[PDB]
Amino acid sequence: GKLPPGPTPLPFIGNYLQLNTEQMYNSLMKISERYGPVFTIHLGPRRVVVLCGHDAVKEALVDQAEEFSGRGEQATFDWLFKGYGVAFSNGERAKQLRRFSIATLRGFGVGKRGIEERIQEEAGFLIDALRGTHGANIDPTFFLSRTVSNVISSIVFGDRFDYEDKEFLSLLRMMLGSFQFTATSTGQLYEMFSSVMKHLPGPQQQAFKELQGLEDFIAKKVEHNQRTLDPNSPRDFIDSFLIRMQEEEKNPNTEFYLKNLVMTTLNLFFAGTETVSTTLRYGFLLLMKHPEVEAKVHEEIDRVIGKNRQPKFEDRAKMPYTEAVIHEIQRFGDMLPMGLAHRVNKDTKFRDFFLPKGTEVFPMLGSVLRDPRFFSNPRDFNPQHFLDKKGQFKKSDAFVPFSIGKRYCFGEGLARMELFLFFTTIMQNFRFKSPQSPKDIDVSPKHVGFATIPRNYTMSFLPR
Numbered sequence: 001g002k003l004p005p006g007p008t009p010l011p012f013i014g015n016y017l018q019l020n021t022e023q024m025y026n027s028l029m030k031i032s033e034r035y036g037p038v039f040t041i042h043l044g045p046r047r048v049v050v051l052c053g054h055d056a057v058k059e060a061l062v063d064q065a066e067e068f069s070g071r072g073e074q075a076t077f078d079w080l081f082k083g084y085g086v087a088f089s090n091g092e093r094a095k096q097l098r099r100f101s102i103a104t105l106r107g108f109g110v111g112k113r114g115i116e117e118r119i120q121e122e123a124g125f126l127i128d129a130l131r132g133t134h135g136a137n138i139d140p141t142f143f144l145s146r147t148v149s150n151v152i153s154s155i156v157f158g159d160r161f162d163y164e165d166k167e168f169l170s171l172l173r174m175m176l177g178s179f180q181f182t183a184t185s186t187g188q189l190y191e192m193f194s195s196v197m198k199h200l201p202g203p204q205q206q207a208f209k210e211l212q213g214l215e216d217f218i219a220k221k222v223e224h225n226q227r228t229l230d231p232n233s234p235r236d237f238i239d240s241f242l243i244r245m246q247e248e249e250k251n252p253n254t255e256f257y258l259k260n261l262v263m264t265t266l267n268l269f270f271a272g273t274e275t276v277s278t279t280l281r282y283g284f285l286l287l288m289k290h291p292e293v294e295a296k297v298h299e300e301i302d303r304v305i306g307k308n309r310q311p312k313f314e315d316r317a318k319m320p321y322t323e324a325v326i327h328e329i330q331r332f333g334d335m336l337p338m339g340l341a342h343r344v345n346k347d348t349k350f351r352d353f354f355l356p357k358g359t360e361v362f363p364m365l366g367s368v369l370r371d372p373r374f375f376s377n378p379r380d381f382n383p384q385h386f387l388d389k390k391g392q393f394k395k396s397d398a399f400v401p402f403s404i405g406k407r408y409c410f411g412e413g414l415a416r417m418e419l420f421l422f423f424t425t426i427m428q429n430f431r432f433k434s435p436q437s438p439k440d441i442d443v444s445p446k447h448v449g450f451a452t453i454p455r456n457y458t459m460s461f462l463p464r
């Protein structure tokens, strides 16, 4: 029993005095610099091992992939999921749900021509919607989120929602509110002190109501799908999972049952909406602070693609600049700064430390995206980070916004395709005008915590 070094905690409050709830990333970088790249923290009463920089994250999550593939505690969410659903499960449950969720999303077209066509189909509606604003200043938040969510929604529910469906707008707010809550100083405090904070009035109460709203909605859709299920012709992710529950009814230890379906579906609908939506939203702001970057992306679209032919995922090979920009938006944007919490599944020897079974591990993916050894200017927006001196696309080992190892984001293929298609389709059609000159636009985050949330803004879409 020999743990990574770390600051001496106080009872219950843990390392609270050294952890500034407003910028947790800075606090943890300060502690790493003091104690070393691998260190122990007390997040309220919870003992956690933290990993800082590429080497430390990669050594754990890759070199010891099997030991570090457990899912740790996440207080904003555990009260609801309770260890069910793909994203929140462990061991055997995680393997089954993951394997099926992957096979099933491939079956509806993910990673092939079919999802490409669904994204092109949905982008079309966004085009119509944005033209329909006639260059007025709009908050792009829900314009983007409607379109993004409709891709995953098609797959998981069988049909897109209408843009004017008021229940659809509601659900989107639920996702937006609860996602942002994990970025706030209150979200951070909650992670430390949930056993008290759950019973107190506060922004946490609204996050709970939204997460509950999302669950009740998925439950209601699953009930409807049961009542009308055709077991030889599945219309969606829900049907396929239902069909698989039928087939596993004889196995009293199956992971395939209603709770795991509701929770996994919740995971896909939520994960499939908010991250891509937020990445787009941050990217637009970044591109209006950098019109010379927007311009070069424009000339690349104009040259490889055209003013009208709709982007296909193949075009990216011939567009290293746009690809560098997109990746740079993901690296700069640092959507999930701690990823999702991990834990060791067995007693584990890591460097010269011993991590007993169940030890919680926070991979600092943000410390990797901003690791100075991999990025010439880690703290600037610089597409040159993903370009060689020939102007060709250059991959980086520190490019980890989807995490790495056994639990890596299996939405990765889908996200990359959406980001490329949606950036390129939108920018084909419109240039972005800010009601502010490039130099007064603040690209620093509104909230940084378990998510990175861009500042509110408005913008004009001006047609080409």
Ligand code: HEM
Pocket: 071, 086, 087, 088, 089, 094, 098, 152, 267, 268, 271, 272, 273, 275, 276, 279, 335, 336, 339, 340, 341, 365, 401, 402, 403, 404, 406, 407, 408, 409, 410, 411, 412, 414, 415
């Ligand atoms: C820009 C978009 C996205 C980013 C930045 C992102 C990032 C991440 C990260 C950092 C994790 C944690 C993996 C770990 O435990 O280490 C994760 C997990 C996960 N993501 Fe995403 N993701 C994105 C899009 C999506 C999409 C579109 C889906 C829907 C298919 C999705 C579904 C999932 C699921 C189901 C997990 C849990 C996997 C598991 O527990 O084994 N993600 N994602």
Ligand SMILES: CN(CCCC(=O)c1cccnc1)N=O
Pocket: 077, 087, 266, 267, 268, 270, 271, 272, 275, 340, 409, 411
């Ligand atoms: C409420 N939500 C919590 C976790 C979602 C998640 O794991 C995620 C989010 C963005 C990208 N990939 C995964 N899941 O339903």
Ligand SMILES: CN(CCCC(=O)c1cccnc1)N=O
Pocket: 073, 074, 075, 076, 179, 182, 191, 336, 338, 339, 340, 341, 362, 450, 451
């Ligand atoms: C917003 N984000 C959730 C971040 C996961 C989280 O809540 C957490 C908690 C403790 C340590 N690491 C991540 N996913 O949608």
